[PDB]
Amino acid sequence: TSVLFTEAELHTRMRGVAQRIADDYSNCNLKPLENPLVIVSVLKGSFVFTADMVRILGDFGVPTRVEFLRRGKHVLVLEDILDTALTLREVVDSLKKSEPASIKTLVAIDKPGGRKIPFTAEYVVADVPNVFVVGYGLDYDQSYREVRDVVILKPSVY
Amino acid sequence: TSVLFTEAELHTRMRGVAQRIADDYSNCNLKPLENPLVIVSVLKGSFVFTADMVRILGDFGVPTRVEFLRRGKHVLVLEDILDTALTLREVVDSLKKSEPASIKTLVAIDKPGGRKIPFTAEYVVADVPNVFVVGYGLDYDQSYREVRDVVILKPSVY
Numbered sequence: 407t408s409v410l411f412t413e414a415e416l417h418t419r420m421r422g423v424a425q426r427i428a429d430d431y432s433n434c435n436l437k438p439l440e441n442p443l444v445i446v447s448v449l450k451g452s453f454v455f456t457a458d459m460v461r462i463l464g465d466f467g468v469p470t471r472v473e474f475l476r477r478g479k480h481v482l483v484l485e486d487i488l489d490t491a492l493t494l495r496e497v498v499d500s501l502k503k504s505e506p507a508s509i510k511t512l513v514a515i516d517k518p519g520g521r522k523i524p525f526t527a528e529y530v531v532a533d534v535p536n537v538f539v540v541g542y543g544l545d546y547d548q549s550y551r552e553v554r555d556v557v558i559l560k561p562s563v564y
Numbered sequence: 565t566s567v568l569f570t571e572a573e574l575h576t577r578m579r580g581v582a583q584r585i586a587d588d589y590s591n592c593n594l595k596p597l598e599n600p601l602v603i604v605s606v607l608k609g610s611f612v613f614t615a616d617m618v619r620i621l622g623d624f625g626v627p628t629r630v631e632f633l634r635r636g637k638h639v640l641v642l643e644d645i646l647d648t649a650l651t652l653r654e655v656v657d658s659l660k661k662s663e664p665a666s667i668k669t670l671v672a673i674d675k676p677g678g679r680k681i682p683f684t685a686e687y688v689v690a691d692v693p694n695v696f697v698v699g700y701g702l703d704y705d706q707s708y709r710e711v712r713d714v715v716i717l718k719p720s721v722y
């Protein structure tokens with residue numbers, strides 16, 4: 407239907423978030439191999455957002471190391487969209503059982519109007535009202551993930 | 565150490581490969597939902613290459629649908645680097661057991677000098693001599709995947 411955020415808008419916001427992550431993780435001072443920022447990507451839709459974000463965080467002095475879902479290290483969980491927050495709440499708690507060092511959440515699209523439980527992400531790229539969107543990893547039955555922009559799908563499509 | 569291919573060089577080659585994939589898959593005429601090009605991404609290093617490639621293939625009229633590793637549909641397997649070809653050979657044969665429609669391989673970095681078995685990819689972004697490279701998804705012990713370019717690592721690093 408209509409475009410909510412373009413690839414240029416997302417990358418601009420992700421650069422601003424990257425500068426915050428660079429400043430907030432300075433006293434940890436991340437270096438490759440020895441002390442990398444462990445990136446936990448929640449498949450599938452997060453792979454587009456994860457691929458761009460790690461290439462931007464490296465541009466800002468933050469070396470990263472990625473893991474894919476579905477101790478003593480600093481963990482940043484990345485998900486494409488934050489809606490009911492039921493999946494991210496279970497993932498964060500499951501990662502706290504391994505006892506890291508500092509765990510935070512970074513989402514690309516946050517829909518606060520769809521929460522089933524209270525949950526706040528430490529870093530949010532953009533906010534979206536309670537409407538169904540596709541693109542930038544988001545799908546409707548495994549399609550439209552490859553759209554470079556976050557758009558609202560036509561009702562006749564679904 | 566030195567840079568072999570930059571992000572600009574890769575995306576330029578990936579646009580040329582995308583035009584070939586668009587022409588070679590015309591008689592299949594891919595449409596979203598009903599007839600999508602099934603993208604099989606081999607984790608982990610392929611996630612950077614997969615995220616860029618699906619956003620380029622959509623730019624060329626090729627809608628895609630992604631699956632991640634580690635019937636009757638057209639399948640294109642994507643891997644970050646092609647070296648011994650032992651993993652990709654086993655993956656292709658395992659996907660042929662599901663009886664698709666047309667299966668091909670697309671790799672970002674092909675090292676022909678490291679083959680343990682004969683294997684040719686249908687689509688290759690760039691060729692690299694038998695040297696250890698990092699960046700663009702490639703790693704040395706889960707680090708340096710976030711480098712925007714394919715570079716050779718300093719020997720003192722490893």
Ligand SMILES: O=c1[nH]cnc2c1ncn2[C@@H]1O[C@H](COP(=O)(O)O)[C@@H](O)[C@H]1O
Pocket residue numbers: 487489537538539540544545546
């Ligand atoms: O706006 C959207 N666009 C794409 N996916 C969404 C959107 N809102 C929720 N989802 C995802 O849809 C799934 C929930 O759908 P359900 O499992 O059919 O109830 C979860 O993976 C959500 O992250």
Ligand SMILES: O=c1[nH]cnc2c1ncn2[C@@H]1O[C@H](COP(=O)(O)O)[C@@H](O)[C@H]1O
Pocket residue numbers: 645647695696697698702703704
């Ligand atoms: O040039 C390289 N850069 C990054 N990874 C490589 C390179 N060459 C081979 N690999 C990967 O290294 C792995 C093989 O290493 P091994 O399992 O220690 O023998 C496979 O996943 C290969 O794809």
Ligand SMILES: [Mg+2]
Pocket residue numbers: 448451485486487
């Ligand atoms: Mg999600």
Ligand SMILES: [Mg+2]
Pocket residue numbers: 545546547548
């Ligand atoms: Mg879905």
Ligand SMILES: [Mg+2]
Pocket residue numbers: 606609643644645
């Ligand atoms: Mg590989």
Ligand SMILES: [Mg+2]
Pocket residue numbers: 703704705706
């Ligand atoms: Mg490796």
